[PDB]
Amino acid sequence: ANTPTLDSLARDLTAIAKEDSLDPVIGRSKEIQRVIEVLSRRTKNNPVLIGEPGVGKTAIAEGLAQQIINNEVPEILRDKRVMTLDMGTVVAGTKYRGEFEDRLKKVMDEIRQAGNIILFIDALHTLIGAGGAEGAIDASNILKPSLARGELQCIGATTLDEYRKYIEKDAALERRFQPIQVDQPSVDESIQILQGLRDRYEAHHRVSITDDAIEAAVKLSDRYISDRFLPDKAIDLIDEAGSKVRLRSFTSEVTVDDIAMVVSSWTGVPVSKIAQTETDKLLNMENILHSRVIGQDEAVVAVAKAVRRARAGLKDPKRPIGSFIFLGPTGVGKTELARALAESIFGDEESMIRIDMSEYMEKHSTSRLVGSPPGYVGYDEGGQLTEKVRRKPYSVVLLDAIEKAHPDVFNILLQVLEDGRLTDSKGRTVDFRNTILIMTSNVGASELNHKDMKDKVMGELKRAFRPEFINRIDEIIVFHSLEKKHLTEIVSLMSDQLTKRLKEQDLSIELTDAAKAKVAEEGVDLEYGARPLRRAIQKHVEDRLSEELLRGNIHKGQHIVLDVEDGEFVVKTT
Amino acid sequence: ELQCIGATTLDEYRKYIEKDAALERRFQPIQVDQPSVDESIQILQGLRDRYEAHHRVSITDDAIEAAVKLSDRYISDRFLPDKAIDLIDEAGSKVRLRSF
Ligand SMILES: Nc1ncnc2c1ncn2[C@@H]1O[C@H](COP(=O)(O)OP(=O)(O)O)[C@@H](O)[C@H]1O
Numbered sequence: 296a297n298t299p300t301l302d303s304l305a306r307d308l309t310a311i312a313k314e315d316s317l318d319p320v321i322g323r324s325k326e327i328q329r330v331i332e333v334l335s336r337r338t339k340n341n342p343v344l345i346g347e348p349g350v351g352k353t354a355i356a357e358g359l360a361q362q363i364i365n366n367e368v369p370e371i372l373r374d375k376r377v378m379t380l381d382m383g384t385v386v387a388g389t390k391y392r393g394e395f396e397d398r399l400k401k402v403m404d405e406i407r408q409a410g411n412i413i414l415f416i417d418a419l420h421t422l423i424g425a426g427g428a429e430g431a432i433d434a435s436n437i438l439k440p441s442l443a444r445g446e447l448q449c450i451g452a453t454t455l456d457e458y459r460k461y462i463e464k465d466a467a468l469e470r471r472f473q474p475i476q477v478d479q480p481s482v483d484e485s486i487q488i489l490q491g492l493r494d495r496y497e498a499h500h501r502v503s504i505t506d507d508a509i510e511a512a513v514k515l516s517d518r519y520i521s522d523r524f525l526p527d528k529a530i531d532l533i534d535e536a537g538s539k540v541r542l543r544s545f546t547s548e549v550t551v552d553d554i555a556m557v558v559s560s561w562t563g564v565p566v567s568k569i570a571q572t573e574t575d576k577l578l579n580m581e582n583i584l585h586s587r588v589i590g591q592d593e594a595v596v597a598v599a600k601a602v603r604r605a606r607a608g609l610k611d612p613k614r615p616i617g618s619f620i621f622l623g624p625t626g627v628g629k630t631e632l633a634r635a636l637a638e639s640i641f642g643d644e645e646s647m648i649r650i651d652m653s654e655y656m657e658k659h660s661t662s663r664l665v666g667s668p669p670g671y672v673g674y675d676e677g678g679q680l681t682e683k684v685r686r687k688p689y690s691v692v693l694l695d696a697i698e699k700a701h702p703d704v705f706n707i708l709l710q711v712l713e714d715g716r717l718t719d720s721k722g723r724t725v726d727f728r729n730t731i732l733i734m735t736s737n738v739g740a741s742e743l744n745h746k747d748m749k750d751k752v753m754g755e756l757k758r759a760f761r762p763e764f765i766n767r768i769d770e771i772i773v774f775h776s777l778e779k780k781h782l783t784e785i786v787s788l789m790s791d792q793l794t795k796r797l798k799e800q801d802l803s804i805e806l807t808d809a810a811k812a813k814v815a816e817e818g819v820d821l822e823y824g825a826r827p828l829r830r831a832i833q834k835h836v837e838d839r840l841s842e843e844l845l846r847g848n849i850h851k852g853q854h855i856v857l858d859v860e861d862g863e864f865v866v867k868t869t
Numbered sequence: 870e871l872q873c874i875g876a877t878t879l880d881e882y883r884k885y886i887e888k889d890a891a892l893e894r895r896f897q898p899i900q901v902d903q904p905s906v907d908e909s910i911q912i913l914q915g916l917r918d919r920y921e922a923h924h925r926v927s928i929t930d931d932a933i934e935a936a937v938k939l940s941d942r943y944i945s946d947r948f949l950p951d952k953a954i955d956l957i958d959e960a961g962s963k964v965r966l967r968s969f
């Protein structure tokens with residue numbers, strides 16, 4: 296009473312479990328016991344493991360195979376062979392009338408002449424598709440009569456959304472299968488997982504693994520990788536480190552630096568950001584800021600103090616890290632401070648989720664923010680801000696021109712400031728926990744000694760919008776008077792950037808501070824913001840490159856100095 | 870113990886991972902992309918020997934850089950270094966037939 300075909304096309308977990316070739320199974324005791332409890336029934340023994348990819352469903356199947364041989368089952372499963380199978384391997388051919396149904400009939404005929412096979416199907420949400428879609432002899436329409444009478448015994452393994460989508464075929468498929476929810480393990484659970492089988496990858500790679508190594512593996516896989524679960528991520532980082540260390544040994548100990556190195560190579564943040572700033576990024580974040588940001592030093596030290604206060608603090612993790620509103624004119628540095636801190640908080644930022652609330656002018660415009668109802672226009676994706684954060688829920692949100700919101704949105708804002716994690720989507724609850732909500736404010740420029748401006752702007756907020764609203768917001772970062780010498784300073788910074796760019800193109804330009812001063816005076820007016828300066832320096836540099844390359848007056852490789860010696864830009868190339 | 874290597878495209882790799890059930894766990898992606906328009910020059914300069922031997926001609930390196938610079942620009946149908954290698958071989962046969 297043996298099974299030729301089923302053994303030919305389905306791996307026998309029991310057989311390779313005899314040989315101790317199977318890796319250990321750690322934890323999951325409650326889940327495996329529940330699996331056995333379901334398998335012990337008489338009519339529908341089939342459990343369907345519902346979780347997320349990479350959580351350890353197949354690990355639970357392996358553990359069950361283990362406990363079978365290791366005399367752990369309650370003698371109703373004693374000597375029963377677990378066989379993993381995949382329908383994809385079964386089908387293998389569709390251009391012919393009945394080949395597939397023939398394979399599956401053979402398989403059923405072997406399950407008959409046996410009692411010890413419990414066929415573990417991975418991703419049985421694909422058990423309904425084969426052959427005709429929903430009106431012909433698919434796989435399910437021939438499994439169901441056997442499944443309902445205990446003829447066949449099974450262990451399915453789906454994903455939650457696949458269960459929800461492909462148990463709309465309820466009638467048979469649901470009642471034939473009992474769900475067993477398996478959830479992804481926590482940090483500590485996963486650390487113990489790893490400590491279970493460190494002596495497997497150690498023996499495979501002949502490399503030594505430390506405990507802080509796997510701690511960093513788990514912490515890193517959580518912080519810097521998403522769209523992948525545990526213990527998958529962890530064991531994968533560990534094994535990648537094992538292989539890479541083995542190679543480096545040729546042309547014997549994995550440590551946290553290697554874990555950082557593999558995570559960096561995966562996601563793209565540099566290694567210096569991951570490892571060394573792990574608890575000192577807040578220690579030098581003010582240095583990072585005052586490097587990237589020039590001016591408004593009082594504002595930047597206020598922000599630094601607030602973020603390190605919330606950072607090395609006991610604040611409720613649930614609600615968002617920082618709620619700051621910048622009062623000031625435009626062009627004073629609102630975005631630069633944001634990008635700088637984000638680059639210092641979430642290293643290598645590219646993360647400021649900017650939203651212009653002046654675009655969400657009116658009442659119904661808030662549906663553009665959250666999304667349309669189901670039976671209405673533009674509902675499928677929608678959710679500008681909601682989908683934006685749902686994508687990467689680890690960043691810094693900047694909301695431009697908070698004033699221009701109709702009062703309809705301030706409600707959503709205060710809900711967010713009420714512990715975040717707002718459910719403002721088509722059934723999606725987005726979480727704003729590690730984020731930082733920042734709001735570009737109104738003019739507020741007229742009020743801008745220190746205490747005077749302060750009381751003024753507080754009253755302007757009283758008159759402007761709710762006191763309760765700012766009672767929600769943490770800090771009021773005031774963007775003081777426009778730049779006077781910081782003008783020339785930011786000219787210098789941009790020109791340093793542009794000189795680097797011009798140098799890597801095999802040139803060298805050095806503009807003296809007199810020309811910098813002239814560009815400063817021209818570019819930005821006293822009333823106007825400091826933004827056109829970008830354009831001003833662009834036009835001057837494009838003119839000089841245009842003329843000098845067109846005229847040919849200059850030769851490549853000769854340093855280029857600009858001055859205002861004649862009252863105009865004079866270029867002395869030599 | 871069937872450890873193997875796979876060579877497909879991107880979209881066909883998507884067609885593959887749509888079998889993630891039993892095949893995502895085992896396989897692994899390795900993105901392999903065009904050599905630089907600069908790198909291709911050293912590629913050819915390294916392998917220009919074999920063809921010039923085959924056709925009993927010789928290939929100047931300016932001809933190689935020019936072939937690369939016309940391949941990346943004026944053909945665009947295929948990819949590096951296939952473009953340039955094909956051009957090298959078509960020239961190394963045309964000139965041969967021109968001689969004999
Ligand atoms: N408790 C555990 N015991 C053994 N392996 C585990 C455990 N938890 C996670 N894993 C590892 O996670 C990886 C993927 O788990 P698996 O169940 O195959 O994902 P999926 O649920 O998509 O099949 C496996 O390589 C497995 O070794």
Ligand SMILES: Nc1ncnc2c1ncn2[C@@H]1O[C@H](COP(=O)(O)OP(=O)(O)O)[C@@H](O)[C@H]1O
Binds near residue numbers: 589591624627628829
């Ligand atoms: N404190 C500052 N330090 C460095 N650069 C600044 C500072 N304030 C403004 N800038 C410059 O202003 C420009 C940013 O303009 P932008 O942020 O779009 O203005 P706004 O925030 O009003 O929209 C950047 O080029 C930046 O160099």
